[PDB]
Subunit: 231 residues, 6 copies
């Protein structure tokens, strides 16, 4: 594949997809055994190791629809990946979305043109694979991890002068990140299973930051949910 | 309210929403006790009765985004309805969607302009209330009712010369109906809970019809799931 | 046809199209002789009778582009209907549109995506059949029924938070209803003749309601114009 | 006004609007008495004279929405013009539109973005002033001039590689020209009256040309209808 | 060609394109030797003469995308024209654009739908031919003519109630005219070379007019740059 | 700044912007003296060093409009960067674009919605800063580096099932990459100067790859042009 330097069999059936390739490294080293780095192209690291004797890969995606779309397309088309799970963060856009909440996205809205390019007059609603989502939901509930299931907004512009998050929040949308629409659309288009699990890095409308301790905790809950869900 | 002749308190917290007002009548009379018709305006019947001692209303919506939007807006704004559950049918657009399957829609795509009118450049993905959906899912599973969770397409044109259902099917979409986008968007916009449960009336791409017996069976499973889910 | 339970020959060449199927019943029983109900599917009644020895049908359409599109497509495709005449009401959006005025729509604007779905970058202007319109206009003038000829707006959302009726009014548009664009487009696409005759139920911008007596009078003028026009 | 060198009072209440300023000159000199040229700016001639003792102006518009929009805006805003009548030609796009037919446009479709710029998600249907149209229609009928009333298509591209005229024809549209949408929209926006009367210069789909004699005849019928209509 | 009455060979390889056909006449008579008028159709004059022994044509385009598109398409397709140079004016929309500045447009934004008609979801950025632009730039610099290189906005509406020039100015856009997008797109589509050289007729946001002397001077600089660039 | 860990003064006035942060490292180490890495966040390295005694930074952008938009916004807003120069590659889409050619983009087309989000009905044409472009052009010419000046296409989807590059090529567009629209728009919006210099990595329509030696050579020419241009 053009952007991933792996050899056949080096990538697992199940790939976790953080945005930050240094977080991919952190996840692999902290959570998995017998880790190998199968990719260094562009410094977008990918790794494979085991969790409870089961192979799992962790691949950085970069930020934004166009970057994740590259990695997801290649993982699917060249490495026959079956389960793709984004583990990232988002900016919460409602007060009722708590800093400790782990978010499982059922769907995502977007201002990316990717789906209008394919469908024109149709609004395509991307959809999480329900089996992955329900497993993740059960795993959170079992351990008492606070979890909220709803939708997010996949944004093209981190700094958007024409942001509609205020209106999106009133329509129930939970938070804003930069990947989910692409992940969910591309996995579905190829008959694979996808889910995004997100932590809250801040409230964008109040500007209130989540603390370092808060972030470390929710991140560990996200990774546990991601792995527990698939064991 | 302009289109519903009910008096305050006559409509329950929970409303079932068939498209066909003769099916609303059928549901109420067959499933509920102590039934009263609270609405005859336009012959779009609505009824209220009890199921296991709990009040439940059943309101016809008519067909298409514009018609359901009228009834959903009025139910919410004038009657403080909390849970809105569409019980309808759809045309299946994938072979893997079986005629006996009961569909719980996580989200819906659309060619209605309703959300571009509000959001312009944003593709708004509507979202089922997860609590209703999970309850409905558990109730199906408990009894062994075959159930599939995914997305549908809300169409403006039953006869569409420019239909994209072929492409929609390849993106994983399950079937086509005429209401869900509006229900899910309008409920979310007002902080209420919504879910669409759908049976399969045919396969639109093969033209193959589901039999009368098949339809009667799935319809009863849909109504059981709808009611069991909320008891 | 899927939504109309009639047998061949049961529907006349000329069909009147009220939105409310209880008004279809009222029109048939009050104005026609030798009436039969040819349709009860979904309670969307249709009837056929005679006026001055000439067969005339009256078919409810429901509300909104998607609902009328179903009935108009079936009437045309399955019953070879030649003349389709909407008899309905609208909310006036200009002070110069008087509560007693009967409106003959030359064309309609819309926020429905139905025509962008077919044409994309083209704004399709629907067009009344001039022969029907001129006949209706002559019949009004002959009897002194106040009549105004201009355009309307076909709306998808009865409750629209992003309504542009203020701007539409400044561009000369007379009033807002939920059907005309679909009727005019679908009739033209199949070489049939269509016209919408509308009464005024209120002024939407002043909130001022037309009285019951006012409504009964204009409704009778509309039906006379509709029938006189075609005798 | 920026593009018209006339002094107040030099332009009549009623202006005829050919596209070609040499045709404006021809119309004035051939049909009117006591003619003066009130405009030579850009060689887009305008003239004023009398017909049966009544003042009438004739102003070239140039070709395309942007050019006519300039002249129509200035005529209205700076010269208080009340009646604006386009007298031009179009390419017929249906076989049933005969080379001798004089076309009165009730409305026009377009691929110009002018109305999406103002309305976004709304398809604005422009509308002829019915009083002018009916007068023109009566004047044609009185003398036996063959006349057809329907819609046209206002095109931005005379040479359009993505032309949809084939589909437009199937929807009943009569022919294609380059002005009407702008005329009808701008007149309505300012409470003035507008009408387009068009001859047929060819059939665009068959490439068949109308002869010089044919064109001279229909042009004279158009001008008679235009003037008779307003006497 | 439909709109140009010239015979083969009558039009030069290089055509200057003023909007105003009276300015085409002025340019030819003032700057060229051995001038002949090859076109009088619609009074949109075109002329051919020599400058320093080299053939050069000057053709009026009219105003707006649709009008220039006609002339540019015909010049290219029927007369094998290789270099097309717009010499016109624009309304400056930034204070830093000085009344004496001659503008060479690298590209243009637009509210014309011409390119969305061809490309839909793509924003097509038109592009000047760099060789013409650089030659024009060198010729200005050589003589000390003040020159600014950047983009313009091609507008459909001279009187635009929804004008975005304020925002366009903040994005660096220099001024507004009515032709460039069409010229640059159509020349590129056919492998020919195009450039727009523009003077400043006013500042649209301050309403400040450039004087007659100012306009005569910049116009002469524009024509010198246009001709010097191609000798 | 959120994504860049530098301290004030650590980033130069002039920043080179490769997509690949490992190429940023390579450029800095190979071309500059007294290099320091000022950023390791997300492994998106940035470095500052000197070239001929003048400070120059080199910052990885990642791939796609959303990723570069983050880095460009932060460089401008938080580090007062004045000159931003993308040094990257593109897939050539015309045969006349030679593998050795260094491309200077005057403008870029896109299927990103970023500008429709800001402008709606306007097609915004981004524009290179001419001074940077001309300097780069002169520096190439001086040394005999083959150089082509024209436009590119900024794509959201590296794997695009609905790619229009065939049509884009016929309109003169040179090649496809994933950054330029964002760079040019965001720099202009903030009064800074931007340019994209691109090498050719392949011909996308012929699938023909450029060799390793070819790529190493053109890359060195690009970097020389980038640096020579600004000394
Ligand atoms: N677009 C956007 N994404 C955010 C914000 N806060 C956190 N994220 C999610 O990180 C980007 C995912 O790579 C924000 O304000 N805007
Ligand atoms: N649009 C559409 N809806 C369908 C079809 N089959 C079943 N439904 C769902 O019924 C309409 C919901 O009121 C079909 O072919 N098209
Ligand atoms: N959309 C809309 N339609 C109206 C209004 N008032 C009357 N009508 C017309 O009735 C709907 C046609 O079925 C209004 O305020 N909005
Ligand atoms: N766009 C277009 N207009 C035409 C055609 N034939 C005649 N007209 C009308 O003339 C243009 C009005 O100024 C054609 O083929 N296309
Ligand atoms: N659209 C527009 N064009 C202008 C303005 N001022 C000068 N021009 C350029 O003249 C039109 C080109 O034929 C203005 O305010 N608006
Ligand atoms: N979108 C796209 N970009 C390309 C291609 N080839 C090279 N590039 C440019 O690299 C992406 C810039 O980060 C291609 O086929 N498609």
């Amino acid at each position: 594949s053009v952007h991933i330097g792996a050899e056949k069999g080096q990538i697992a059936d199940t790939v976790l997809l953080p945005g930050d390739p240094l977080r991919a490294k952190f996840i692999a080293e902290t959570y998995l055994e017998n880790v190998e780095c199968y990719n260094e192209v562009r410094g977008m690291y990918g790794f494979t190791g085991t969790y409870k004797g089961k192979k799992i890969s962790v691949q950085g995606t970069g930020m934004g629809v166009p970057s994740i779309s590259i990695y997801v397309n290649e993982l699917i088309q060249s490495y026959d990946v079956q389960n793709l799970i984004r583990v990232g963060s988002c900016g919460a856009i409602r007060k009722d979305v708590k800093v400790r909440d782990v978010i499982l996205a059922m769907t995502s809205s977007t201002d990316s043109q990717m789906n209008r390019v394919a469908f024109g007059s149709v609004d395509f609603a991307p959809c999480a694979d329900f089996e992955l989502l329900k497993n993740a939901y059960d795993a959170a509930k079992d351990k008492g991890v606070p979890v909220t299931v709803g939708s997010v907004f996949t944004a093209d512009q981190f700094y958007n002068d024409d942001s509609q998050i205020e209106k999106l929040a009133k329509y129930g949308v939970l938070g804003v990140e930069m990947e989910t629409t692409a992940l969910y659309t591309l996995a579905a288009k190829h008959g694979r299973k996808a889910l995004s699990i997100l932590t809250v890095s801040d409230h964008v409308l109040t500007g209130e930051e989540t603390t370092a301790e808060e972030r470390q905790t929710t991140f560990h809950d996200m990774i546990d949910v991601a792995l527990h869900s698939v064991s």
